[PDB]
């Protein structure tokens, strides 16, 4: 069906209201002021099997993606005091970075029925999956993180004759933010009693959630669609960059150092400093 409800507690309360209501409306013919006692009549829920079927997290709008401030990893010099161009090698190095995700339910689906669902941050591309989860019934905040260590081998840099180059390594970072909808299909029933008072009979009851709404609002398995909301924000290490600057011309050229495998091992490049050809 097309319809979807954002508060399961409202439905549960209607079912109870209806139960109390019909109990009194039946007596109305005998006692014309019976409805005026609506507040005095007790209803005692005893159990339920309310369940949220197939809870899942769905993106609600496209993620927004912003580059964050670059992480400065280090600086080095490579000096060619020779009359021709030379292949000079940088030192190998490591750097560490933590990928994070935080996720918060902003609008529950009502408190009465517990459910959780997994969320994988989208537009990942790091090769390390980052998952958390959402609670349907509480406004919780779930975090997760993964520490990544980069092993970057020596790089080969062609330096022109009589030139020192300065090399800077830095790590780009992306922030992926957005909203989600928490969806599922509620089934089940509450049971209990309006207890007997004086001459008034006990009414042992069982009401389903699908009975508290119009027949059009139901799916073909009898369930009702529910929806909550949440959001997320993940920080991901992205591209390892090396900028090489020619100290004679002060021109700077940019290179990406690609990943080799998986601890993340990077490739060893052969790169031209500015001033070569
Ligand atoms: C080819 C690129 C060379 C640029 C010089 C990079 C040297 C960085 O070196 C790294 O610095 C880290 C701090 O950021 C330290 O934690 C590591 O131990 C060290 O290996």
């Amino acid at each position: 069906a097309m319809a979807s409800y954002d508060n399961v507690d409202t439905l549960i309360e209607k079912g109870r209201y209806n139960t109390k209501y019909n109990y009194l409306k039946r007596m109305e013919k005998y006692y014309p002021n019976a409805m005026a006692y609506f507040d005095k009549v007790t209803i005692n829920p005893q159990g339920n099997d309310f369940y949220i079927n197939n809870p899942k997290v769905e993106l609600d709008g496209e993620p927004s993606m912003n580059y964050l401030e670059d992480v400065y990893v280090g600086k080095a010099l490579l000096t060619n005091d020779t009359q021709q161009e030379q292949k000079l090698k940088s030192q190998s190095f490591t750097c560490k970075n933590t990928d994070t995700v935080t996720a918060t339910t902003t609008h529950t689906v009502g408190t009465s029925i517990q459910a959780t669902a997994k969320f994988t941050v989208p537009f990942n591309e790091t090769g390390v999956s980052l998952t958390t989860s959402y609670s349907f019934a509480n406004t919780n905040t779930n975090t997760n993180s993964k520490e990544i260590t980069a092993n970057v081998p020596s790089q080969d840099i062609l330096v022109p004759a009589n030139t020192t180059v300065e090399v800077i390594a830095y790590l780009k970072k992306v922030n992926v933010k957005g909203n989600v909808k928490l969806v599922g299909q509620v089934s089940g029933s509450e049971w209990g009693e309006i207890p007997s008072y004086l001459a008034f009979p006990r009414d042992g009851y069982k009401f389903s959630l699908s009975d508290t709404v119009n027949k059009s609002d139901l799916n073909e398995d009898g369930t009702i669609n529910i929806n909550g909301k949440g959001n997320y924000s993940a920080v991901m290490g992205d591209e390892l960059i090396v900028k090489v600057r020619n100290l004679n011309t002060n021109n700077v050229q940019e290179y990406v150092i690609p990943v080799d495998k998986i601890i993340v091992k990077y490739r060893s490049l052969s790169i031209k400093a500015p001033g070569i050809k």
Side-chain angles (χ1 to χ4, degrees), residues 1 3-28 30-39 41-45 47-74 76-88 90-112 114-117 119-167 169-180 182-193 195-214 216-217 219-228 230-260 262-264 266-276:
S4 190
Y5 297 74
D6 67 26
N7 203 337
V8 134
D9 295 348
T10 299
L11 303 185
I12 292 166
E13 271 153 346
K14 204 183 193 172
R16 291 184 193 157
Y17 160 94
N18 281 351
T19 307
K20 271 168 65 197
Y21 184 81
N22 296 335
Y23 177 83
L24 290 171
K25 193 75 185 184
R26 207 166 286 120
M27 303 178 171
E28 207 177 53
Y30 299 122
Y31 312 87
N33 66 335
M35 218 70 250
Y37 290 86
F38 193 95
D39 279 336
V41 31
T42 296
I43 185 159
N44 290 346
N48 77 71
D49 59 1
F50 292 134
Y51 196 79
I52 292 171
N53 299 288
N54 300 310
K56 48 183 99 182
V57 188
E58 273 166 3
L59 302 180
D60 177 2
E62 263 203 291
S64 97
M65 289 180 271
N66 290 266
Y67 284 107
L68 290 167
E69 88 188 14
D70 293 335
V71 181
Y72 172 85
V73 175
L77 297 170
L78 291 174
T79 295
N80 182 345
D81 294 335
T82 262
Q83 306 278 75
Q84 61 202 102
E85 74 187 41
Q86 296 297 343
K87 201 185 72 170
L88 291 159
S90 67
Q91 72 276 42
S92 73
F93 62 88
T94 62
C95 62
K96 297 210 175 179
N97 172 73
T98 300
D99 291 346
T100 59
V101 57
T102 173
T104 291
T105 293
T106 45
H107 294 104
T108 73
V109 83
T111 65
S112 295
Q114 301 297 308
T116 68
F119 172 65
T120 298
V121 335
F123 292 83
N124 187 331
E125 103 183 45
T126 64
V128 184
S129 46
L130 201 51
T131 62
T132 183
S133 52
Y134 285 86
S135 157
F136 281 52
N138 299 278
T139 45
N140 299 347
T141 296
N142 288 287
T143 67
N144 197 9
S145 70
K146 292 199 163 169
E147 183 174 300
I148 285 97
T149 307
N151 295 341
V152 188
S154 185
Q155 305 295 310
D156 287 0
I157 298 164
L158 259 171
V159 182
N162 295 301
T163 303
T164 288
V165 298
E166 180 195 60
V167 186
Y170 65 89
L171 189 65
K172 297 207 75 66
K173 284 178 69 170
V174 186
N175 184 19
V176 186
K177 276 184 162 146
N179 296 318
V180 304
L182 312 175
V183 295
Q185 296 85 56
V186 65
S187 66
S189 312
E190 180 176 288
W191 54 92
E193 51 155 23
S196 55
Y197 188 46
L198 287 25
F200 306 110
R202 177 186 183 266
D203 184 2
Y205 76 85
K206 181 160 178 166
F207 77 83
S208 76
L209 224 54
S210 55
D211 226 84
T212 62
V213 301
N214 197 293
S216 53
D217 300 305
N219 305 329
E220 291 113 29
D221 64 355
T223 61
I224 297 185
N225 296 135
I226 57 164
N227 70 281
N231 61 28
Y232 62 95
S233 164
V235 177
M236 330 249 71
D238 186 68
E239 240 159 46
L240 179 68
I241 288 171
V242 160
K243 274 183 174 178
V244 0
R245 178 181 162 215
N246 178 316
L247 295 187
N248 295 337
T249 64
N250 288 298
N251 183 248
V252 186
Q253 288 292 322
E254 181 171 358
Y255 295 86
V256 172
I257 306 304
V259 166
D260 174 38
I262 307 303
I263 289 180
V264 175
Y266 282 77
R267 248 173 266 178
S268 189
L269 293 194
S270 175
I271 50 166
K272 297 172 166 178
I276 290 295

